[PDB]
Enzyme design. Structure first.
Site, PDB file in Angstrom:
ATOM      1  N   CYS A  42      64.225  43.975  31.521  1.00 40.90           N
ATOM      2  CA  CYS A  42      64.324  45.426  31.661  1.00 40.90           C
ATOM      3  C   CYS A  42      65.593  46.027  31.097  1.00 40.90           C
ATOM      4  O   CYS A  42      65.648  47.225  30.841  1.00 40.90           O
ATOM      5  CB  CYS A  42      64.114  45.890  33.082  1.00 40.90           C
ATOM      6  SG  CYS A  42      62.373  45.772  33.507  1.00 40.90           S
ATOM      7  N   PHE A  83      54.817  47.817  36.732  1.00 34.11           N
ATOM      8  CA  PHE A  83      54.871  47.273  35.366  1.00 34.11           C
ATOM      9  C   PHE A  83      53.665  47.743  34.526  1.00 34.11           C
ATOM     10  O   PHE A  83      52.542  47.839  35.027  1.00 34.11           O
ATOM     11  CB  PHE A  83      54.899  45.742  35.405  1.00 34.11           C
ATOM     12  CG  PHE A  83      56.242  45.129  35.768  1.00 34.11           C
ATOM     13  CD1 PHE A  83      57.442  45.654  35.294  1.00 34.11           C
ATOM     14  CD2 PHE A  83      56.286  43.985  36.562  1.00 34.11           C
ATOM     15  CE1 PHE A  83      58.657  45.065  35.621  1.00 34.11           C
ATOM     16  CE2 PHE A  83      57.486  43.390  36.890  1.00 34.11           C
ATOM     17  CZ  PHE A  83      58.679  43.926  36.419  1.00 34.11           C
ATOM     18  N   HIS A  95      66.881  53.329  32.323  1.00 37.18           N
ATOM     19  CA  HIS A  95      65.725  52.500  32.500  1.00 37.18           C
ATOM     20  C   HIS A  95      65.055  52.830  33.834  1.00 37.18           C
ATOM     21  O   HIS A  95      65.668  52.687  34.888  1.00 37.18           O
ATOM     22  CB  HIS A  95      66.063  51.031  32.469  1.00 37.18           C
ATOM     23  CG  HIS A  95      64.872  50.202  32.799  1.00 37.18           C
ATOM     24  ND1 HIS A  95      63.781  50.137  31.962  1.00 37.18           N
ATOM     25  CD2 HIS A  95      64.547  49.508  33.909  1.00 37.18           C
ATOM     26  CE1 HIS A  95      62.836  49.420  32.544  1.00 37.18           C
ATOM     27  NE2 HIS A  95      63.283  49.010  33.717  1.00 37.18           N
ATOM     28  N   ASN A 144      56.628  51.528  34.097  1.00 36.05           N
ATOM     29  CA  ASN A 144      57.766  50.732  33.688  1.00 36.05           C
ATOM     30  C   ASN A 144      57.292  49.711  32.646  1.00 36.05           C
ATOM     31  O   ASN A 144      56.750  48.658  32.994  1.00 36.05           O
ATOM     32  CB  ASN A 144      58.407  50.064  34.921  1.00 36.05           C
ATOM     33  CG  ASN A 144      59.519  49.095  34.578  1.00 36.05           C
ATOM     34  OD1 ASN A 144      59.872  48.879  33.416  1.00 36.05           O
ATOM     35  ND2 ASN A 144      60.118  48.518  35.610  1.00 36.05           N
TER      36      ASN A 144
END
Lengths: 389, 389
Positions: free
Chosen positions: B163, B214, B303, B336
């Protein structure tokens, strides 16, 4: 004030130099003369009479004398699934290499840092390279912690890289060091064959080659531009250029797949022939701008993927037999340690140059070349300049 | 030439700029409102009432609307070992992602190259980043082949990165571009969640987070110094510095292990808390040299690891609501996408800035910051400068 101004102050002035080289291997080792008997015994394969004879022939051809191996007979006796040809074993392999790869890398790095002789807090970057295992955080993180480097080191974690990647990390370090004033790059290549070790099979003849050649080791460098003589920094070699290319008609020559049974290689195509047929184009690209065309005028480092690559390059270029000496010495004494190997040869070359009392670290010559060979087929070409002794 | 003269001629003059951005996602997508039902249905887990309610609440708080996923219901129906909690499945996952990661990366790359507007033969370097699978040769080779780039591109293959690595590839590309005159770097981050997808379990509550957050996507950049306006090159953002650090007291916050059951994450410590406590140190380090202390005066890219990170950072620094808008938008519309996410956020920011007719690509502001967060705990900090519109 301006971005331009910031940039010129931020960057380094000169070429990246290799300021120190340290190496390490597992203490455990096997003599190649004894390896066929050992390998076929510990893998419960002694009934494979004809295949064992084939493996003896391959080991005899390898020209390898000794290989260091983390895996011990005692450990393998407790882990038969790793001794089998293709049993589920990746978890066990990972458990080993996610600990041992950074540990061996640390041993090499400590030696490099001691030679360099500067505070470890002066290290600004860490480049960690392996083909043995993957994890999050990576081996780069573990090495940082083991060495107690500054938490703010800039790290690059090079995983599953393969045999060309001793050249790759030189290429990486070169840009890091040259683009960042003051930067001091700790480079570590650490390889452990526990990911690939498995029992033999006549359905996997490629496996027999790997079983004869692959070995363990780690090598560490300090790389930096603008050496500070006053505190005792002195480059050993300086990098001038680094290049990379995919050979024509080589698609599918070497594949390596990480599976539930561990890492498995598959070889197709004539790799020594492909490399030898094409390597002059890389030499031309690298050296024509320097006005150099006599490949015997260079000091040589080549990834020792096996003896045939070296023999065929030598024949193809008309190299004097001396040129491949340092490369073959490492192959003989250590085997094919994948990415680490070319860094061991650099160490051998500069050490022997000193012992023999010649005029430079590069066997008394001015210019040199370092080749990495790996899946692709990829050839990496690094141009080096020696330093006076 | 001396080595120093060669060096001066070899390097670029100015700061690295992002010359183009392209993105791509699998067509197939899921709406988050429907995912608890879908996920628990397709994994034959709908009888796990208390666990499903835990998952539902995690999704309800995730602030995600839509996630793209290469994995389809039909495929999962045909591959039930992928739907089990911890069945042997790495080989199947690898078979998927060693193909789909570079393919999705190519789609993003084609868009970036079209925006850039220059011949693809002018790409000199390729940086490929993923957290989804490993192979030899790597996805970097596969992309090179799929796009028909010059065989002599200089490649870096960043595997198992995680990440923080959207920031990492910016840090890599900056040194490649700035240190090499004429260099034009193709950067690709491509992430496919087939490596982590699995059935839910009350023995793996950490896995519910990943299952909720995710998602799949790829982003591509062209990065280069010394833009040539006469052929239509124009940077979108310029990079000024790139840093990396390991937060104190964060050991084991995020571990991720590649196992025979695929990729598995384990969470400890208060990750939003750790980041909020420590982020000002990174801001100070990056901006104190620039004379900047007002964090609301920057344009922001963070992020989007989850909403609590963003919420707690916003509260800690006293950021205006608008600062995290672009970040939250990407989180909401895409989830994400690990390393690719911040590159989507850069894209969203510059596109919204143009649509809104503000003064610069960074929301009308001059200076900006981009954060990557990952295992370590690692925080990466990239200082950016906008470009006038």
């Amino acid at each position: 004030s301006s971005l331009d101004e910031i940039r010129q102050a931020q960057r380094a002035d000169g070429p990246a130099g290799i300021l120190a080289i340290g190496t390490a291997n597992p203490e455990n080792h096997v003599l190649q003369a004894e390896y066929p008997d050992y390998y076929f015994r510990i893998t419960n394969s002694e009934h494979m009479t004809d295949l064992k004879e084939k493996f003896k022939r391959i080991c005899d051809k390898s020209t390898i004398r000794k290989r260091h191996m983390h895996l011990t007979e005692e450990f393998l006796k407790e882990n038969p699934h790793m001794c089998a040809y293709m049993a589920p074993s990746l978890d066990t392999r990972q458990d080993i290499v996610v600990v041992e790869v950074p540990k061996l890398g640390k041993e090499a790095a400590v030696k490099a840092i001691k030679e360099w002789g500067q505070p470890k807090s002066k290290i600004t970057h860490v480049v960690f390279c392996t083909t043995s295992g993957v994890d999050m955080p990576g081996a780069d993180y573990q090495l940082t912690k083991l060495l107690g480097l500054r938490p703010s080191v800039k790290r690059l974690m090079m995983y599953q890289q393969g045999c060309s990647a001793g050249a790759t990390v030189l290429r990486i370090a070169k840009d890091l060091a040259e683009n960042n004033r003051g930067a001091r790059v700790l480079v570590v290549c650490s390889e452990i064959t526990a990911v690939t070790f498995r029992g033999p099979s006549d359905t996997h003849l490629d496996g027999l080659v790997g079983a004869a050649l692959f070995s363990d080791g780690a090598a560490a460098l300090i790389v930096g531009s603008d050496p500070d003589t006053s505190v005792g920094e002195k480059p050993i070699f300086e990098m001038v250029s680094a290049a990379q290319t995919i050979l024509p008609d080589s698609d599918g020559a070497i594949d390596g797949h990480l599976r539930e049974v561990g890492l498995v290689f598959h070889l197709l195509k004539d790799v020594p022939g492909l490399i030898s047929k094409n390597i002059v184009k890389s030499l031309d690209e690298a050296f024509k701008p320097l006005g150099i065309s006599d490949w015997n005028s260079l000091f040589w480092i080549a990834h020792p993927g096996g003896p045939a690559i070296l023999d065929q390059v030598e024949i193809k270029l008309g190299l004097k037999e001396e040129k491949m000496r340092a490369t073959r010495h490492v192959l003989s004494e250590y085997g094919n340690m994948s990415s680490a190997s070319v860094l061991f040869i650099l160490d051998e070359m500069r050490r022997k140059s000193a012992k023999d009392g010649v005029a430079t670290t590069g066997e008394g010559l001015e210019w040199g070349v370092l080749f990495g060979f790996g899946p692709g087929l990829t050839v990496e070409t690094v141009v080096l300049h020696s330093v006076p002794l």
